Amino acid sequence: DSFWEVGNYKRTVKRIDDGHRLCSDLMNCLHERARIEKAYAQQLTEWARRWRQLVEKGPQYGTVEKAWMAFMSEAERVSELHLEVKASLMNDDFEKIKNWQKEAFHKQMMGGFKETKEAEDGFRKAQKPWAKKLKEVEAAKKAHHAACKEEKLAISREANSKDPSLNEQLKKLQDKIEKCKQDVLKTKEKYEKSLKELDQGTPQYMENMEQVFEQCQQFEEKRLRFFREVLLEVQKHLDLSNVAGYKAIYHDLEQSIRAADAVEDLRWFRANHGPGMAMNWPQFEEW
Amino acid sequence: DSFWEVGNYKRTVKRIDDGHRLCSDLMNCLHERARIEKAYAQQLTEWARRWRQLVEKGPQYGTVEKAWMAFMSEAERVSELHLEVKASLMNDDFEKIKNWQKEAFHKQMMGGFKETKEAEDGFRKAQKPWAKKLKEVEAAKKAHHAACKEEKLAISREANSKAPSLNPEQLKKLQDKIEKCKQDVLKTKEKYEKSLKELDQGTPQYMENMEQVFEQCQQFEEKRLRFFREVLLEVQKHLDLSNVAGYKAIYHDLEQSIRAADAVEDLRWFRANHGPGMAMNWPQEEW
Ligand SMILES: [Ca+2]
Ligand SMILES: [Ca+2]
């Protein structure tokens, strides 16, 4: 249940497979955002294309037609602006994480990552002496839970011994007890002797596990620091107020709307479609 | 096909209808853009829901998980900002246009708009008078050419050849018919002449009549234009997220969350809970 138990390092070795996994989960996350931005872009271009044709063809004209059109232009700047978020998310961040994942993790010909197997190996190897001593100890204690039982049972047999049927039979009982009692004694010493060695062994074993562990942390710290550095970059690319000309799109929009002059427009109609027009007052044609 | 040509006032009449139509196209335009706006917002919201759960269900925990999640937080906030654009658009703008159209343009029993019929009527009036006399000139343009051509048909037979023609009386009739023809040209010209001189007076008064109604279509049209300009400025402001302090806040905040990412305290937590800093029951048994 705890890290020091044999093989309970399985977790810190898994963190490295998780390490790779997360480089993809993050790429996918960005990748999907990218499509969202380009979709909105696409929609905006479409809208402006649609409405450019409709305003040209329709009956709105003049400086109020200009103001209307202004709006399909701002859609076109916004479209370009979100389109290059896709561009930044994709060309840069995604590829940064992809290249990092190539340089940090390495698939091997018959398995997983070199990294994973290396941590998995240094762990096995720093745990090996001490796990050996452990099996030694457990076997010994079991051989001491065995002698104990048999001795106790020979002793019960003496209880059965106080049967009026016989009595070579008792002597055997006493001798059996003596040896069993003695054998309990030896197995005892063996066991506690092996337990001692395990304790000394343990300070040394403890050193080797931490050596291995602290370079698992190290590698992991690299991935964490990268996530940090890169997410700070991602957020710049998302921020459109980080763009110089964003503000200008709106300033230009405003300017175009302001220009629309109702009167300039009214004077254009009078002269081109109204009373302001040239007329050939009827004349007398001979012939 | 100049304005003054009887009935050419039709093109300025058609300007009204078109006004209502343009109001509608604008409304539609706007609505489409709203629908666009909301679609972005919504795709963001799905992205945030998706990735929040995914990040939560995955192996990144800690302060670095938090940063990634702050990321999910921004999409939603941006979505708020665009649903808000959508609302402004539909709730302010579309409604403004929709109500404006309804107070400028009134159905008339029997179809069409009371204002288009108004203009059609007054033009007609003002012209009616002058299009009578013009119809007269035209018939006197047909009087005069009739006579002239009749004269030109009567010379030729006489010349040919006469080819006899046993009589002289016939030639006399021919000469006389030519004399009738000079009479006709003469008195047809006089009439054409009277009618032409008649129009002229017609003209100054009729012209005054025409400018009177035209100006009255100008005043109506000016309204439309003025209003169009007014609304577009507003639309602009609604669409403008380049000057919204609320938006930049999204990223100040986001960035602060990414900076809160600490790789070290994330790994101080890992060894405490999953590494060497875990408590352990070292072996030390009976029965
Ligand atoms: Ca047009
Ligand atoms: Ca998680």
UniProtKB/Swiss-Prot annotation, chain A:
A single cellular component GO annotation: early endosome
Free-text tissue specificity from the UniProt record: Widely expressed.
Residue window of the full protein shown: 16 to 304 of 486
Record-level Gene Ontology MF annotations: cadherin binding; cytoskeletal protein binding; identical protein binding; phosphatidic acid binding; phospholipid binding; protein-macromolecule adaptor activity
Subunit structure: Homodimer. May form heterooligomers with other PACSINs. Interacts (via NPF motifs) with EHD1 (via EH domain). Interacts (via NPF motifs) with EHD2 (via EH domain); this interaction probably stabilizes the caveolae. Interacts with EHD3. Interacts (via the SH3 domain) with MICALL1. Interacts with RAC1. Interacts (via SH3 domain) with DNM1, SYN1, SYNJ1 and WASL. Interacts (via F-BAR domain) with CAV1. Interacts with TRPV4. Forms a complex with EHD4 and MICALL1; the complex controls CDH5 trafficking and coordinates angiogenesis.
PTM section of the record: Phosphorylated by casein kinase 2 (CK2). Phosphorylation by PKC probably decreases the membrane binding and tubulation capacities of PACSIN2, thereby modulating the lifetime of caveolae.
Protein name, entry field: Protein kinase C and casein kinase substrate in neurons protein 2
Family: Belongs to the PACSIN family.
Membrane topology, from the record: Peripheral membrane protein
Region ((Microbial infection) Interaction with HCV NS5A): 1-287
GO biological process: actin cytoskeleton organization; caveola assembly; caveolin-mediated endocytosis; cell migration involved in sprouting angiogenesis; cell projection morphogenesis; cytoskeleton organization; modulation of chemical synaptic transmission; negative regulation of endocytosis
Coiled-coil intervals, chain numbering: 10-257
Domain called F-BAR: residue spans: 1-265
Function according to Swiss-Prot or TrEMBL: Regulates the morphogenesis and endocytosis of caveolae. Lipid-binding protein that is able to promote the tubulation of the phosphatidic acid-containing membranes it preferentially binds. Plays a role in intracellular vesicle-mediated transport. Involved in the endocytosis of cell-surface receptors like the EGF receptor, contributing to its internalization in the absence of EGF stimulus. Essential for endothelial organization in sprouting angiogenesis, modulates CDH5-based junctions.
Principal subcellular localization: cytoplasm
Free-text note regarding domains: The F-BAR domain forms a coiled coil and mediates membrane-binding and membrane tubulation. Autoinhibition of these functions is mediated by an interaction between the SH3 and F-BAR domains. The F-Bar domain also mediates the binding to the cell actin cytoskeleton through the interaction with CAV-1.
Phosphoserine PTM positions: 256
Alphabetized UniProt keyword annotations: Acetylation, Cell junction, Cell membrane, Cell projection, Coiled coil, Cytoplasm, Cytoplasmic vesicle, Cytoskeleton, Endocytosis, Endosome, Lipid-binding, Membrane, Phosphoprotein, SH3 domain
Modified residues (N6-acetyllysine): 38
Places the protein is found: Cytoplasm; Cytoplasm, Cytoskeleton; Cytoplasmic vesicle membrane; Cell projection, Ruffle membrane
